[PDB]
Amino acid sequence: MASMRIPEDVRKDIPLTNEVIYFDNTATSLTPKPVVEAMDEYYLKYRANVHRGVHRLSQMATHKYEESRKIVADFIGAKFEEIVFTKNTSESLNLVALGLGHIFKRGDKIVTTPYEHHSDLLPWQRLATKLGLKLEFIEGDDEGNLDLSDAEKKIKGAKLVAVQHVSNALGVIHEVEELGKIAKDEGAIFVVDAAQSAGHMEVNVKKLHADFLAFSGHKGPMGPTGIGVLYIREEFFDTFEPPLIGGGTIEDVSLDGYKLTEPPERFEAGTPNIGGAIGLAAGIRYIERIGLGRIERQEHKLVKRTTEGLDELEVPWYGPRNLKKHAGVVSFNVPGLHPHDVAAILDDHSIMVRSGHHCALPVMKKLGINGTVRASFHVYNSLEEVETFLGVMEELVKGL
Amino acid sequence: GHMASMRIPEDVRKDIPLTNEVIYFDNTATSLTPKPVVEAMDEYYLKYRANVHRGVHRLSQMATHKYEESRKIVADFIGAKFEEIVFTKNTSESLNLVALGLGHIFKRGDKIVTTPYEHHSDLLPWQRLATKLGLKLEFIEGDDEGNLDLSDAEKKIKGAKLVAVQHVSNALGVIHEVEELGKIAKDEGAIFVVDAAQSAGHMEVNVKKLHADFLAFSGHKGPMGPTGIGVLYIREEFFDTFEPPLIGGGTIEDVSLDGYKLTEPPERFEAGTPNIGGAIGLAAGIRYIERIGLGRIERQEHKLVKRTTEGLDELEVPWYGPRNLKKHAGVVSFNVPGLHPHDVAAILDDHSIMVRSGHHCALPVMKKLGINGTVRASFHVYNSLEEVETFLGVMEELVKGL
Ligand SMILES: *[C@H](N[C@@H](C)C(=O)O)c1c(COP(=O)(O)O)cnc(C)c1O
Ligand SMILES: *Cc1c(COP(=O)(O)O)cnc(C)c1O
């Protein structure tokens, strides 16, 4: 951690904060200058492919790529070899399903939540359709709070359990450690979608009891696009079948066949996103300078003021009322305005928010709504921004 | 996207600071990146950073427009329609997606034909599919230079379900007769898959001319783009056949807890947030390449290969691949008798010349030729004859020092 003012010192590294009030962090974060500079350095000063080529540029790129893997492993409490780079969380979750497919038999059971983003639902639906599996959903309420008694009943006899850490639509923070303990007791593989928690709060594989965990660098970690992570706990190394194979994944190859190399390269086919890995390690180091605790504290300030100000204007908001279980995401609706209209009006005031179903249609259907307006934060967002937002909201509500 | 007046290679080198520091002859592994490509990407990250998918707000609109622009630029570069372009992470992802998405079409005993010179990414997926489903995987005959026997190709491709070939060999530098192989596959009713990872950005790559049904390339190679962006072309006639291997956010029209319906191409194939920055960077590399012109690129590279190979012959240093330089790309693999390729490469590195050594992810090529690996010097338009002369001078000192 370093000494700095929050949010001011972070804002100074993000020129866009001078132009807009960016409340669409759940979709993607804004990117600080030092992350762009780290990537630029690769492209202009040490550009090369990895895999320990003899030449000095490849040696440098290889060292920085390995450094970056180790940075990511330490960020989530994993070992170097348990970190695989992918393009995004969605790729990572697809690879889990694809790579474990062979272990299932007709009738086996998979359990998830009813609030999953499509990327943590479709792959399991496909697998369940292909193999004749049972796909069950833990009961929960309209705020996103899961029924843990029901979770114990459902996870019992489950082959695999997949859950999101944080809902991208509702902002609910699930009791992932509790669910992971339940899964471990029952002998179920435990897969965590951490796309909305990484970089916003602590994410640790050992604490969560994760067997597989996915996250996206472009979200909370303040990294670039095109870089995702898939954590594979070591005990699955020889069980997980790499879905993508080719250059970089082998030890030997003849016309007649092949032999794969060891993790993590075993799972990384072709030239990785070397620039993106370097940028994501820069973003994790930038997050570490600020500190996760300061980030979580700042975001709770924002959520508390926002949700109190919407209460004053009688604007309904979704998700947990208990703010200790509410991440930096506030979904809401203005009675008698479609959420795209609210979004458009806010855009006119240079406030960026998202509208619609948020790739979580089953949440919208469970709630009986077509979508929501969503304001989401990061540590560079300020209470002054929130006040400006609430002023615009007030005028909108007073206008009718 | 129009050619401009330029001095080659000087006016390219001015945009690549590393050319002032090293002689970079490892372009087959990855290209050096011009400043304008970096600038374009920096613009996204610092000036219009947002996710795509037409979010209501202005930054999402700007990002979505630039992402769609970049897909059009890639489509036009290869002669495809917008909707036939899917972004991936690299060529290797693209070729794996082809095999995973077409696996369902095969029946036990169907035949897949490829070359014996394929990079592992255009071999392993077909080996896995053939082992799993009980298919026949055959290899067209060819010589040690990489020249395929087209008579054998016709024989093998008759009755094949799918044909997969590389346009250019990354180890040998052979340019295969892809148009002819594609004509054969079209005339025999075989699906034609082209690995263009070593051709894109170095010569013309056009899906119509090649008779491609699927085509893969990497942005970080000849197109002078960033890492982490690849392309998969899927001809429209396969939209009702090809099963998306990766599904989830951005791929759907509707979802319930009981199931889902997918959207239309190309979003049907693109699960989760794309590499928006990398697609923008790749479109900038393609525009940079269009200003230079593929013809100028091919001409410059040929001059470099011609002098390199002639100079190696003067040193009695053996080199691989075709002797007919019209069929030899900007890649020269060689070996120094008595010296392991890694040790050659290290001597070159001492002299600030960057080459690659080893098997080049093409073990069957090495095993066919009876060698363990090679030293490989590979070029781009920014490489100069001056550099080749420096290299030849260092090779001369090495050989005299043995
Ligand atoms: C890339 N080959 C080089 C990395 C090398 O020979 O050193 C290549 C691929 C794989 O591209 P990725 O971007 O996925 O690594 C596939 N086929 C060919 C012909 C080449 O050159
Ligand atoms: C965004 C998100 C995903 C998908 O992330 P991508 O980077 O778009 O693949 C998955 N799950 C959750 C909870 C998300 O917020």
* CB-nearest partner of A353 from B57, B95, B116: B57
Helix axes of B276-292 and B58-78: crossing angle, nearest 10 degrees? 40
Best mutation site among B118, B120, B165, B218 for ligand 1, i.e. most ligand atoms within 8 A of its Cβ? B218
In angstroms, rounded to a whole number, what is the distance separating the alpha carbons of residues A244 and A247? 10
| Reported resolution, Å | 1.5
- State in Å: Cα A117 to ligand 2 middle: 7
Q: Which residues, 6 or more positions from A305, have their beta carbon under 8 angstroms from its beta carbon?
A: A383, A386, A387, A390
Hey, what's the torsion of the CAs at B281, B287, B292, B296, to 10 degrees? 90
Question: Nearest 5 degrees, angle CA A34-CA A38-CA A40?
Answer: 110
Same domain? For B351 and B245 the reply is: no
* DSSP code string of A100-117: HGGG--TT-EEEE-TT--
- Residue A219 neighbours by CB under 8 Å, 6+ apart: A25, A26, A28, A29, A195, A196, A198, A199
Instruction: Output DSSP code: residue A234.
Output: G
CA-based end-to-end distance of chain B? 50
Q: A168 CA distance to ligand 2 centroid (A)?
A: 8
Strand ranges inside chain A, DSSP E: 21-22, 83-86, 109-112, 134-137, 160-164, 189-193, 212-216, 228-232, 250-254, 257-260, 329-332, 351-352, 354-356, 372-376
Distance B226 CA to ligand 2 centre (A): 23
Contact status, residue B198 vs residue B331, Cβ threshold 8 Å: yes
Q: Which residues have CB under 8 Å from A251's CB, separation 6+?
A: A259, A260, A261
Collapse the DSSP code of A178 into the 3-class scheme (helix H, G, I; strand E, B; otherwise coil) and give the result: helix
Residues 6+ apart with CB under 8 A from B187: none
Catalytic residue among A36, A244, A313, A359: A359
In contact, A352 and A16? CB cutoff 8 Å: no
- Contacts of residue A140 in chain B, CB cutoff 8 Å? none
Going from the Cα of A228 to the center of ligand 2, the distance in angstroms, rounded, reads 10
Q: Which amino acid, one-letter code, is at A2? A: A
The CA distance from B234 to B85, in Å, is 7
Residue A277's alpha-carbon distances to A36, A68, A72, B226, in angstroms, are 12, 6, 9, 12
Type of residue found at A386: V
The active-site residue, picked from B361, B366, B385, B399, is: B361
Report yes or no: B245 and B101 within 8 Å, Cβ to Cβ. yes
Go through B356-381 and write b for each residue having 16 or more CB atoms within 10 A of its CB, e for each that does not: bbbbbbbbbbbbbbeeebbbbbbbbb
Q: Could you give the angle at which helices A383-399 and A292-312 cross, rounded to 10 degrees?
A: 20
Alpha carbon distance B345, B348 (integer Å): 5
Block residue for tokens 């796909």: A135
Q: How many CB atoms lie within 10 A of CB A31?
A: 27
**Total of domains in chain B:** 2
Tokens 């049972």 appear where? A134
**Greatest CA separation for chain B:** 73
Q: For residue A65, give the nearest of A221, A275, A283, A288 by alpha carbon.
A: A275
How many angstroms separate the CA atoms of B230 and B232, rounded?
7
Give the max Cα distance, chain A. Answer: 74
Q: Within 10 A of B121 (CB to CB), how many other CB atoms are there? A: 30
Q: What is the distance between the alpha carbons of residues B362 and A250, in angstroms, rounded to a whole number? A: 11
Determine, for residues B356 and A55 on separate chains, whether the beta-carbon distance falls below 8 Å.
yes
Give the residue, by CA position, lying nearest to ligand 2 atom 5. Answer: A89
CATH code of the domain containing A140: 3.40.640.10
CA angle, A221 then B53 then A383, to 5° = 50
Amino acid at A5: R
Backbone torsions φ then ψ of A75, nearest 5 degrees: -60, -35
**Residue A138: how many other CB atoms lie within 10 Å:** 23
**Cβ within 8 Å of residue A14, ≥6 positions away:** A30, A31, A32, A33, A380
Measure the CA–CA gap between A268 and A261, rounded to whole angstroms: 10
Contact B57, A30 (CB under 8 A): no
A120 lines ligand 2 (CB under 6 A): yes
The answer to whether residues A221 and A118 belong to one domain is yes
Nearest-by-CA chain B residue for A48: B30
* β-sheet bridge partners, residue A193: A164, A214
Q: Are B137 and B127 in contact (CB under 8 A)?
A: yes
Residue B60 region by backbone torsions, left for phi larger than 0, else alpha for psi between -120 and 50, else beta: alpha
Q: How far apart, in whole angstroms, are the C-alpha atoms of residue A243 and residue B355? A: 31
Per-residue three-class SS string for chain B? CCCCCCCCCHHHHCCCHHHHCCEECECCCCCCCCHHHHHHHHHHHHHCCCCCCCCCCHHHHHHHHHHHHHHHHHHHHHCCCHHHEEEECCHHHHHHHHHHHHHHHCCCCCEEEECCCCCHHHCHHHHHHHHHHCCEEEECCECCCCCECHHHHHHHHCCCCEEEEECECCCCCEECCHHHHHHHHHHHCCEEEEECCCCECCECCCHHHHCCCEEEEECCCCCCCCCCCEEEEECHHHCCCCCCCCCCCCCEEEECCCCEEECCCCHHHCCCCCCHHHHHHHHHHHHHHHHHCHHHHHHHHHHHHHHHHHHHHHCCCCECCCCCHHHECCEEEECCCCCCHHHHHHHHHHCCEECEEECCCCHHHHHHHCCCCEEEEECCCCCCHHHHHHHHHHHHHHHHCC
The backbone torsions φ and ψ at residue B246, rounded to the nearest 5 degrees and listed phi first, read -115, 120
Pair (B82, B10) in one structural domain: no
Q: How far is A47 from chain B (nearest CA, A)?
A: 6
Q: Give the residue from B250, B276, B292 where a domain finishes.
A: B292
Give the nearest chain B residue to A365 (CA atoms): B256
The strand pairing partners of B139, in sequence order, are B114
- Best of A23, A96, A255, A340 to disrupt the B interface by mutation (most B CBs within 10 Å)? A255
A216 lines ligand 2 (CB under 6 A): yes
Using DSSP, state whether A306 is helix, strand or coil: helix
Cβ distance of A31 and B22 shorter than 8 Å: no
- A228 with A254, same domain: the answer is yes
Q: Which member of B92, B248, B255 has the closest CB to residue A246? A: B92
Residues paired with residue A354 on neighbouring β-strands, in sequence order: A374
Q: In DSSP terms, which residues pair with B230 in a beta bridge?
A: B88, B218
Residue ending a domain, among A272, A290, A308, is A290
Task: Based on the fold, state whether residues A227 and A351 are members of the same structural domain.
Answer: no
Concerning whether A189 is annotated as a catalytic residue, the answer is no
Which residue of A68, A225, A256 to mutate against B (max B Cβ within 10 Å)? A225
Same domain, B230 and B346: no
- Of B292, B308, B323, the last residue of a domain is B292
Tell me how far apart the alpha carbons of residues A328 and A198 are, in angstroms, rounded to a whole number: 12
Residue B26 sits at the chain A interface (C-beta within 8 Å): yes
Instruction: For residue B328, give Cα distances in angstroms to A356, B44, B202, B322, B336.
Output: 54, 38, 12, 6, 20
* Angle, CA B113 vertex, CA B112 and CA B115 arms, to 5°: 145
Is the domain of B302 the same as that of B265? no
Contacts of A357 (CB under 8 A, 6+ apart): A169, A363, A364, A370, A371
Is residue B199 within 8 A of residue B167, CB to CB? The reply is yes
Tokens 């036009």, residue?
Answer: B76
- Residue A316, domain CATH: 3.90.1150.10
> By the 8 A CB rule, do B97 and B232 touch?
yes
* Mutation site, B15, B22, B49, interface A, largest A CB count within 10 A: B49
Quote the Cα angle for B254-B259-B265, to 5°.
50
Determine the 3-state secondary structure of A348 from DSSP.
Answer: helix
* CB-CB contact of A208 with A180 (8 Å): yes
Give the residue from A216, A211, A255, A260 showing the smallest Cα distance to A235.
A211
Tell whether B359 is in a known binding site.
no
Q: How was this structure determined?
A: X-ray
Task: State the Cα–Cα distance between residues B272 and A266, nearest whole angstrom.
Answer: 23
For A67, the 3-state DSSP assignment is helix
Phi, psi (rounded to 5 degrees) for B319: -130, 155
Instruction: Check pocket membership of B352 for ligand 2, CB cut-off 6 A.
Output: no
Q: Which tokens go with B59?
A: 């930054």
CA distance B183 to B160: 14
Contact residues for A114 (Cβ-Cβ < 8 A; gap 6+): A137, A138, A139, A140, A362, A363, A366, B257
Domain range for B385 is 1-27+293-402
Tokens of A103: 């272990």
Q: Which of residues 155-214 of B touch A (CB under 8 A)?
A: none
On whether both A48 and A152 belong to a single domain, the answer is yes
Tokens 């029209």 belong to which residue? B253
Rounded CA separation B223/B214 (Å)? 19
Q: Determine the residue of A29, A90, A167, A227 to mutate for testing ligand 2's pocket, defined as the one with the most ligand atoms within 8 A of the Cβ atom.
A: A90
Q: Could you give the CA distance from residue B75 to residue B86 in angstroms, rounded to a whole number? A: 10
Q: How many residues in chain B?
A: 402
Contact between residue B188 and residue B158 where contact means Cβ atoms under 8 Å apart? yes
Same domain for B150 and B5: no
Task: For residues B142 and B273, state if they share a domain.
Answer: yes
Cα–Cα dist B125/B248, whole Å: 23
| Portion 46-85 of A in contact with B at CB < 8 A | 47-49, 53-58
A249 contacts on B by Cβ (under 8 Å): 120, 124
In a shared domain, residues B280 and B400: no
Q: CB within 8 A of A260, min separation 6: which ones? A: A242, A245, A249, A250, A251, A266
Alpha carbon B313 to chain centroid distance? Answer: 29
Residue with tokens 């409340």: A23
Residues B266 and B163 in one domain: yes
